[PDB]
Amino acid sequence: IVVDPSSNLYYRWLTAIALPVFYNWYLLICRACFDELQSEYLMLWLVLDYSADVLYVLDVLVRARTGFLEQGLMVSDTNRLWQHYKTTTQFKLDVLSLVNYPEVRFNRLLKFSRLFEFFDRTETRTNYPNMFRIGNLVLYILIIIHWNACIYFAISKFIGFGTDSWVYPNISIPEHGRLSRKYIYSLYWSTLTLTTIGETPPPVKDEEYLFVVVDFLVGVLIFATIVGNVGSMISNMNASRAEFQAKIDSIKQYMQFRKVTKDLETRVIRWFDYLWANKKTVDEKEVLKSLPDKLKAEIAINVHLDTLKKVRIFGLLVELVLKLRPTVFSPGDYICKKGDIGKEMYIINEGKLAVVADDGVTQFVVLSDGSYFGEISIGSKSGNRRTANIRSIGYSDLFCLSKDDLMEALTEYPEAKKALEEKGRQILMKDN
Template sequence: MRDEEREARRNGEEVDDDFYGNGSQCTEWQTHFSAKNFSFKIILNLVHMSDKAMWNSASDTGWCPDKSEDEIIQLSSISGELDEKSNFHKENLFYKFCSSQRLKWILLCSEQKCTNVSGSMLCVDGDCSNWNSADRFVNAETPMQAPCQGRGQRASLPLTLSTFVPNTTKQTPKSQSLDRLINWRTKKPFSTENVQDDDFIRKFAVGYTATAYADDIHRKGFLGWLESKVVLPYGNAYYYWTAVVTVAVAYNVITILLRAVFDEYQHPYYIMWLVLDYCCDLIYICDMLVKFRTGYLEHGLMVRDLRKLALNYVKRLRFVLDVVSILPTDIFYIYLQNINNPIVRLNRVFKLPSVFDFAEKTESRTSWPNAFRLFCLIACILTIIHINGCLYFAVSEAMGLGSDQWVYNDNNLTDSFSRRYFYSFYWSTLTLTTIGETPYPEKDEEILFNTVDYLIGVLIFATLVGNIGSMIANMNAARTEFQARMDAIKQFMESHRVERELQRRVIAWYDYQWTNKTNLNSDAALATLPPKLRAEIAIHVHFKTLRKVTIFQDCEAGLLVELVLRLRRQVFSPSDYICRKGDVGKEMYIVKEGKLSVVSDDALTVYATLAEGAVFGELSILNIAGNKNGNRRTANIRSVGYSDLFTLSKDDLWNVLKYYPEAKKLLINKGKEILRKDNLLDETVEDEQEQADRLADSFQARLQALKDRYETVIGRYEEMHRRMNRRIAFLESKLDRRYCQDTTV
């Protein structure tokens, strides 16, 4: 590309480029890209004119006639210009050139290098496929140019703004595979809804999660790189790593004692056990290195200084336990001259606190915390039974198998490992649960072991079992509370002799709420959160609903945040009236789920049906003077089935509008425009609300002036009072001195 052409493109001027084709057909295309906040879009508008799509990159790369669908060509000219004007890199920009009456364009961009750019696809004809990650772009400002005539014709490439039009054509298997590739590559599908949502969310300025560090990185080289790689204790990477460490610890806790007691489980597979043992040791060592780089909060900021992180880890008891757990006790294999004695590795169980860390993090992340707690308790109980069963068999071997009735009987020498282990597990279960029904101990050692087992069963095991009962009760607490409310309603209706049909409807409404989990008290659940987090949750839950209200679309973000926090949920049963004609409008409604019917007074005629996303009643809460309906409902609206609606009351709206006077004027004007279109506004009637506002402003101004004058008078009075006190004190002191002189004389 010539230098003058590059300069013209930078200035946004039209540039002519040669389009070479095979024959008399060629393809015209238009390009548009914009750079704002490192967010870039490239829109290609193409007109396909032949069976063989001919393309020219408007650069020195030349033309690509009739390429196969599997060939991907780098768009070097456009990527070069983008590289000059932005942070795009050529290796990240690709498009796919297809023949057979199709031309597809793909943008694949690395998230690390190109921010907020998602994969897109462009196709040109009726047979082109529909991709979820992209759709068709059609120029809306200028019509498509006519195809160039003949080989070597010149075509202009103006930079124009294009609008988005979704493609609804059929999807092919090849396009499906490429679609999956783009979705995997970009992690963020491109769609019309996403574009619209981004504009609305941007208005709210929703925050994002970030990490603030207590210190800046000043070092260079390896130490500087190491400081920048601090491990976040609440991050996903650290959580998954603790899961790996938990697996290693669980392996040691379960297998070390098992292999030490049951030799037939250790000896034949000792090579496998050695490999697994040293793999776990490697995980232990890596975990210590990770903890040396695990950050912690100091004054609310994440520390990443190498020395501080190391001292924070070394000064804790966890460091001592980690060191003890990784001591090379395997050297006792040499001293004992027996590699099949894994009891020397018993110090590995000192790593057990890492399991508790993983359980705590999982409990805070999972959506079923009660079920996870129950699982942890059951796992703990089974582990205790397992360890106690292994100890029982070890004591039996020490006392002599079959020496009395209490120890394990060795009459059957062919007992397999599973037979021995399961009998020991069975004996341990009976003993720890204090069920008994086991042979009585005969020797002192057996009595001591049995006594310790009973104490463990009473003090520890019973506590764990009791916790399981409490957890099950907590899991059913919501159902119990709901059932109590339902029983109270039933008793009330029975005592007041409410008709059976109404009772049936009330019970059906309660059943619907429980089945669809709509009975949850969201206000109570969110009460402990700070206002900012509550606002963001409400925005993500309700913003799609609130943006459907026409009068709120141009309001400032602060007002929308206040309103979205005041939306209330209501559930209506089949045939319930949401409002009747002539009722005073005190709320506006937004249909979240279900269908509503606009019916006649006798409910026999259905005029219209309101589906999900419909909004009604918004004008009745604005108190617009001159409204011929007088803020009253103009139709009967009834629920067809069960309907889920959001409501915004008039009081909540006006309480918020007190702090947003400009937004209040905007809403009133929008409401008047809607009434004018329907010829429902009386222009001669003065706006009562404006008159009330003027009176309120006047009263406020006068009150403020009176307050200022009062403060001035009070200030003067206090000053005069201080001066009088000083004068009186001076006179009293002078009088006292004179009195003293007279007394002396």
């Protein structure tokens, strides 16, 4: 057997090893600082520690018998795999890890790297990354508050219960002799100390003074860090929406400075409402330039042939959809007025447009998702211009394309070259 780190089996094993490391950190500092859960029910810690021990040695076997990506290929030679694993600090920590019995159980905490690999893999893999970031920083403040609650109960056990007012009170009293009372009061003191709140009892000895000073300074820096990253995450949750409202506000400030007319004001605001409520508010040319060009062209052929498998006369478009550049035209706008110069051609995708001749009247035909706008402008007594009025009837999208770009993508297709020139000359034959 051999497995790669991209495998869904490997992610499922990262889940099943993310369970007992989290168990071991949380309940092992709770056991080794409380010394009442053990003496109440040892047997659950026997069966859970046996399960965590066999999952740790199975993680040693799976981290032995997984492979990597050397020279672009996965590696299956198991003796060199064992030598590569044996020269690694992760296996060094694992044989320092796998040497009842809460001291060697406390030695079984050193496999945190599986939990960090779980957090990366889930942070990339999920479709609720924000859920994950809210969930793992809530997990980090609960582990910090739990370890500080158990450190407080160990300091109170080292001083003595109820010797003075700072420590836990006397456990001969049956109200302070419940394990639920011990854990939730030490958690409440840990919350009051770590979140810098106050209304604790005031300390009256020197180790209590040094510990409350160290705990308040760790409380300020841990409060700042972990409950400032939650502020950065919950204010980076709406980020592209914040950039879109930034674009809206900036355009509205420029229009309220420049004293523009009210119909243009509400047309621009309704264009912004169209781009918000139609969910097309992501600018793909700016946020999708950092991808490499091959996967950029692969997602281009995928989504553009999924929208555009309604191809005209010439099937196989692997070179013609390279530089499709969409633009959204508002309803009531004219694509080209009656007699203008022509540079670029427009194809229709998910739009419904129509032809005019006197700007509003003379609808000859409505237009489906088939053909071009600028098959003429690219002898027949004509050339290099458009002679048809095309008003945008609805909220359409239309790709634009360049003549030199289609010519240099057309040098491999002479059949499409002669088909395009023949259908443009045939359109001039039915027009002039």
